Design a protein around this ligand. Structure first.
Ligand code: 3KG
Ligand code: 3KG
Ligand code: MG
Ligand code: MG
Ligand code: ZN
Ligand code: ZN
Lengths: 315, 315
């Protein structure tokens, strides 16, 4: 099976559509592993990784996402695809090493997620929180990536020099860390200012890491940039995960926040509104200012915001 | 009427096209009864049913479909044909008794449909809802089937033992009930787990029952698997019928849901993309896994889904 992935060929029709931001992987489950291979090949080249190792890596990454409602294998590939479209539209802004790292990082950014937030683990003294005090899950995700890399025949970065091996791990590490939404708000705030004053410079490494940060957020949340019926369905998976967590708290005696409370569904429409206004819109707005070809992301997001506004009005 | 049918020979220029999953019966209206005959002869043999009784039965079946926009005689034969194509492409898996039963089941699965859903009937306290509390129309459909079998000169299962007769009515009954879409979701979900755990055993009768059910669902929805110009037009019949149910609710003065509401005509494309994603795609996806030969159904379904995307996007 991990061999059948090597003889995979992407259908011609899909070769055209995969380039667009709005593309939806959802109806093509059996092709997701192959879709990642294709995307890595178009962005980085066909002789970048050894195909054997690359295919073994990908299959092992799929195996280590759980059967949870939202933070699953589908999510990993969804996030990788959006990165791909960002990279493709701003190709020469990034180095070979960065594109390698960011795609792999997107594929790995939620590895071994259990369906629980950083709040939960920390509040209920889960061992993961004892090990990782800030950005709990995200640190575990990066730890999971290294583990897979160190498996027999799984080290896709074996052709690299020591120097480039370290550089790419660090790129991946910051990238995964950056998907902690707790860190997004500060990041986006800084970038907005640097853009306003005209002080943002891509050759400044810390500015560069900030940009990559924002890119990781945009990709993590891109399911709000898909066509309305796709986003609506994803919303169900997201909320199915939140409610499952809130129920765990109710069993433990403690009342969950509204977002995680299956008894507060009425509040959901207004919760989506709040999320779009406070998080998602300002995310893609800042991104479009820095990387103008990412405009379609902001555009789609605005469409979905507009939709939720109709729901609140009574449709 | 039944006598001109005994004389019927399918024209040779359709002897190959008929075997294709995407075959459209639409241009061949007055051949529909003969096409069924033909499909039965090829899949069960010309020795299976007495030709006189079989012809009488088909014509009574035809007359007991009402002149409704979608749940009519055309749909009955369209669904039967898809079953034909499945059975043909999995030559060895199903028993003689199963094949006899499944074709008859498909042709009868919507008998005497009134163009109203179950919830409509239960809502407004229709005598049929008072009779069958769950799967209301489906239990009526089967009832209509048994009535026609028990007409004079119509019992096509005359040449079966008492035991086989009981088995084949059980096969038909379960298959008709399974076309209740409410039960589809549970069934597909179980089947997915069984494939995933590898615990799916076709020696297990209640596993066969589940598989048969999924095939029923697949055939029932197969209008989403035809060539675009055929799928696009059948959609208009489906919604005509949804809207008539809503109109009836609005005559009575009650608000229907958007699917049935014709003041929501514009949202049909979005409504199609949603349905394909939440219902059609997972159906044929799980069917293809269980029965690899049925893959052309999924492929066709994917092609029509992207067509709706283009409609929504103005392409
Ligand atoms: O649709 C949503 C509603 C709420 N949240 C959310 C999540 C966490 C924190 C917060 C908080 F606002 F509380 F900080 C809000 N995320 C999404 C969303 C849309 C796309 N990905 N995700 C997502 C992001 C992260 C986790 C789950 C889902
Ligand atoms: O094109 C469609 C749009 C919506 N529905 C639908 C039907 C029931 C429930 C739901 C619900 F979304 F509520 F679950 C959606 N079915 C079809 C469709 C495509 C092919 N056959 N049928 C079909 C299936 C069943 C009945 C009539 C038509
Ligand atoms: Mg995460
Ligand atoms: Mg029905
Ligand atoms: Zn994520
Ligand atoms: Zn039907």
């Amino acid at each position: 099976e991990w061999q059948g992935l090597m003889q995979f060929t992407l259908p011609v029709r899909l070769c055209k559509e995969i380039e667009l931001f709005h593309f939806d992987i959802g109806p093509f489950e059996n092709m997701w592993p192959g879709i990642f291979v294709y995307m890595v090949h178009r962005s980085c080249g066909t002789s970048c990784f050894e195909l054997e190792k690359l295919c073994r890596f990908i299959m092992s990454v799929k195996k280590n996402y759980r059967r949870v409602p939202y933070h699953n294998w589908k999510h990993a590939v969804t996030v990788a695809h959006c990165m791909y479209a960002i990279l493709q539209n701003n190709h020469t802004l990034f180095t070979d090493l960065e594109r390698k790292g960011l795609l792999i990082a997107c594929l790995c950014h939620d590895l071994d997620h259990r369906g629980f937030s950083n709040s939960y683990l920390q509040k209920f003294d889960h061992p993961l929180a004892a090990l990782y005090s800030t950005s709990t899950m995200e640190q575990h995700h990066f730890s999971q990536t290294v583990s897979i890399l160190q498996l027999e025949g799984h080290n896709i970065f074996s052709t690299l020099s020591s120097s480039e091996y370290e550089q790419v791990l660090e790129i991946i590490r910051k990238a995964i860390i950056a998907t902690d939404l707790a860190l997004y708000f500060g990041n986006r705030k800084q970038l907005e200012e640097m853009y306003q004053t005209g002080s943002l410079n891509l050759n400044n490494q810390s500015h560069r890491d900030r940009v990559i940060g924002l890119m990781m957020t945009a990709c993590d949340l891109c399911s709000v940039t898909k066509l309305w019926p796709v986003t609506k369905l994803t919303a169900n998976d997201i909320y199915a995960e939140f409610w499952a967590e809130g129920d765990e708290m109710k069993k433990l005696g403690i009342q969950p926040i509204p977002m995680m409370d299956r008894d507060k569904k009425d509040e959901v429409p207004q919760g989506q509104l709040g999320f779009y206004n406070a998080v998602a819109i300002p995310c893609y707005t800042t991104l479009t200012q820095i990387l103008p070809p990412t405009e379609p992301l902001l555009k789609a997001c605005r469409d979905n915001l507009s939709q939720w506004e109709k729901v609140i009005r009574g449709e």
